[PDB]
């Protein structure tokens, strides 16, 4: 019940989809990590990766310049290690010295940086989508969160990496995309709406979902 | 590798030996080891993975147990059975779902500033709502599996050890230093070196944490 099934399924949609509607993007998907690559990264960060994340890495070791997730790049294992260490330095500096918030409330620690937030996606401008290994009291271990430079408010966008990948795969299959050969961007088809930043889409979806679940105790 | 497993084993030797030579009755409250499947079942129930030093401790004693119409090993505070750990964790998980003066941490940002967290596993109890336990969800300047105080009267949480091993060992060092009074009789803390007064062990741990933070 870890989201491994979802990860494998999703990568199929995404592998098939890219090869059909954007080969240039397909070609940036790297070879699988070896178990040793993963072990070495776990040793370096002193962390245990969630099953669905390891499953994802054993399919593609990130991307080798045009973001797969509507412009946002899937990070290589080496990039994940390096960036985690970069966030860990930032955290150290803050510990030896705007208001940070969470949606849902108390799901994510109200802090700028945490050693246990492992970035998997980057916008190459300081913001990420990653796996949270130190949830707030109303969060879940290995929930998927947004965090980074411009994320004073953190959002939980998925229950695991599998559900995140699959919901991205569902967006592609639903036709919620525009090509700008060109760059992949998001548009909501059913509504015939404008191009939107995928972060804003994820944020609104999180916010909507939270609001519709509030009534149930 | 450096999980503190060694420390746990070493500590339990001193504590087994000490109790036996000084307070037989207390030593008799130390339960038989926990079996591996007992643990597995507890890990399944809480959907959590115990740290090595904690598992190591449980595979030496499954907490304490008495039949007096009890008697905390940690200067009055009782080492919890696995069954008690499971039950109490689920009780704190209920509290967390239902959810307070200002919640705080020493060191700052080591422990989440919250009343209750599902990943705080109680190992010791004062039987009045307060605990020592293992923190499986540290703040950004904390360490995974650090030992913390939390519960009814701990609006401020204290990190008292880097792992369960170091905690047990520092308790063993207190015994061997002679920092104790028996009131057979109940075990209480006193700092022998400075001929100090009898004090609550929580207060001792709190001051030590506070001093350690200031010197760092």
From Swiss-Prot, chain A:
Subcellular location(s): the record lists: Nucleus
Q: Coiled-coil regions in this chain?
A: none
Q: Which domain of life is it from?
A: Eukaryota
Disulfide bond positions: none
**What do we know about how this protein assembles, alone or with others?**
Interacts with TYS1.
What job does this protein perform?
Protein involved in the regulation of cell wall assembly and 1,3-beta-glucan synthesis, possibly through the transcriptional regulation of cell wall glucan and chitin synthesis.
Q: Anything else of interest in the record?
A: Present with 5680 molecules/cell in log phase SD medium.
Protein family according to the UniProt entry: Belongs to the KNR4/SMI1 family.
Q: What is this protein called?
A: Cell wall assembly regulator SMI1
Q: Which organism is it from?
A: Saccharomyces cerevisiae (strain ATCC 204508 / S288c) (Baker's yeast)
């Amino acid at each position: 019940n870890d989201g491994v099934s979802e990860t494998l399924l999703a990568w199929r949609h995404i592998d098939f989809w890219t090869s059909e509607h954007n080969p240039d993007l397909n070609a940036t998907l790297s070879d699988p990590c070896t178990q040793n690559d993963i072990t070495h990264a776990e040793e370096d960060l002193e962390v245990s990766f969630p099953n669905p994340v390891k499953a994802s890495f054993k399919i593609h070791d990130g991307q080798e310049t045009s973001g797969l997730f509507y412009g946002f790049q899937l990070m290589t294992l080496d990039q994940v290690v390096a960036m985690t260490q970069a966030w860990r330095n930032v955290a150290k500096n803050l510990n030896k010295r705007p208001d940070q918030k969470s949606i849902p409330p108390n799901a994510v620690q109200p802090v700028y940086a945490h050693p246990a937030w492992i970035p998997l996606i980057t916008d190459n401008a300081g913001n990420h989508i990653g796996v949270d290994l130190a949830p707030g009291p109303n969060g879940k271990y290995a929930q998927i969160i947004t965090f980074g430079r411009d994320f004073d408010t953190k959002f939980v966008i998925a229950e695991n990496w599998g559900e995140f990948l699959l919901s991205f795969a569902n967006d592609l299959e639903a036709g919620n995309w525009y090509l700008v050969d060109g760059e992949l961007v998001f548009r909501d088809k059913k509504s015939n709406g404008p191009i939107q930043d995928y972060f804003e889409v994820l944020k609104r979806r999180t916010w909507i979902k939270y609001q519709l679940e509030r009534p149930h105790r």
